[PDB]
Amino acid sequence: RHMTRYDSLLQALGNTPLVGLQRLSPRWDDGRDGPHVRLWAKLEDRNPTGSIKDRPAVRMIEQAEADGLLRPGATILEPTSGNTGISLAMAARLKGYRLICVMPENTSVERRQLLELYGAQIIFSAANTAVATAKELAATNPSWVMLYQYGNPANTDSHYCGTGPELLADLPEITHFVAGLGTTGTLMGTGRFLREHVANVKIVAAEPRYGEGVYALRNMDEGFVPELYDPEILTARYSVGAVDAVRRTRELVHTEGIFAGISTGAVLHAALGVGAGALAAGERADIALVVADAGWKYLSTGAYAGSLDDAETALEGQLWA
């Protein structure tokens, strides 16, 4: 936290850079035509394992330690094959836990191999079925700990206590926060913190209309995610197709040099919509947007095909978290 030397990787969690997008911003400089409309990218790929999930994964573990649920050498069980799986794998390793990950047998070999490199043991399930297999294994097995990231309060708390406070410290002038919509932890936690501290701040969701849609059904149901449907909590939600996401991630790498993951294309598409609105409205805007991971893990997935058509097919057939 303005620190540069750390006694372990876990201590380097968070405190990620916020970077201005002078070229992609609708109007970086205030001038005769009106106030600035600025985009600021919060680079969550700078975390230990290269995604925002290091925050909730560490917090979920630390909360389970505090609640006496995790004792030395325990086994953690997780029905995830993505960014949370990777983060929990790193974190479990550094703290002395075993991590077991359950995933469909038709999970890409590259996703499987990244998990294994960090130390996760894999159990394959039939190609919410992975969650069902994880649950039978919870039954048959002796005090394995499931943490469940979707309902988990420690997931939202990690953003309420981490991401939100860092954004306010770096960008006290923030007018809008834009992030992806998966477990909802990022938007719920960071949004609650910002709404408590910044009068009239606007919270905007970017939801990919591509990928598996792990939480997509969930997030359509007000019984599961009531806050998403309160206009005083969430101002707006963009549903973003693959073709727009692909165009935006190309635009970001070419205009600003930032090589973002596939969820960021939805986030940038929303943030550009919000910025176009503020510019047309003659309003000053300082719009913070999350880059939750970098492009690196998607290079083997077809996401960088030449054809935006082939890139579309690739984004539709893969997980974005």
Ligand X SMILES: *Cc1c(COP(=O)(O)O)cnc(C)c1O
Binding annotation = 83, 182-186, 218, 263
Helix, strand, or coil (residue 294): strand
148 part of the interface to another protein, by CB under 8 A: no
- Residue 29-48 contact track with its own copies, rule CB under 8 A, x = bound: -----------x--x--x-x
Q: Return the closest-CA partner of residue 99 out of 85, 113, 111.
A: 85
Using the 8-state DSSP alphabet, how is residue 159 labeled? I
User: Which is nearer to its own copies, 141 or 255 (by Cβ)?
Assistant: 255
- Residue 192-231 contact track with its own copies, rule CB under 8 A, x = bound: ----------------------------------------
Q: Binders of ligand X among 184-243, rule CB under 6 A?
A: 184-186
Residue 132 touches which member of ligand X, its own copies, another protein, none, C-beta under 5-8 Å by kind: none
Chain breaks in the chain (C to N over 2.5 A) after: 127
Tokens of 140: 């048959």
Q: How far is CA 8 from CA 37, 50, 56, 95, in A?
A: 39, 16, 18, 11
Residue of 131, 137, 138, 253 interacting with another protein (CB under 8 A): 131
Spell 16-44 as b/e; 16+ CB within 10 A means b: bebbebeebbbbeeeeeeeebbbbbbbbb
User: Which is nearer to its own copies, 102 or 114 (by Cβ)?
Assistant: 114
Extract long-range pairs of 66-70: CB within 8 Å, 24+ residues apart: 69/145, 70/97, 70/145
Q: State how beta strands 202-208 and 176-180 pair.
A: parallel
Residue of 18, 216, 253, 308 interacting with another protein (CB under 8 A): 216
User: Which is nearer to ligand X, 42 or 53 (by Cβ)?
Assistant: 53
Residue of 38, 53, 176, 269 interacting with ligand X (CB under 6 A): 53
Binding residue numbers for pyridoxal 5'-phosphate? 83, 182-186, 263
Torsion of CA 210, 211, 216, 217, to 10 degrees: 100
Residue 312 touches which member of another protein, its own copies, ligand X, none, C-beta under 5-8 Å by kind: none
User: Which is nearer to its own copies, 205 or 319 (by Cβ)?
Assistant: 319
Q: Return the closest-CA partner of residue 210 out of 76, 77, 301.
A: 301
Residue 235 touches which member of its own copies, ligand X, another protein, none, C-beta under 5-8 Å by kind: another protein
CB 88 within 8 A of CB 70: no
By the criterion CB under 8 A, which residues form the site for its own copies?
1-12, 15-23, 40, 43, 46, 48-50, 90-91, 93-94, 109-110, 113-114, 116-119, 166, 169-171, 250, 253-259, 294-297, 299-300, 304-305
Catalog residues that contact ligand X under the rule CB under 6 A: 51-53, 83, 180-186, 261, 263, 292-293, 321
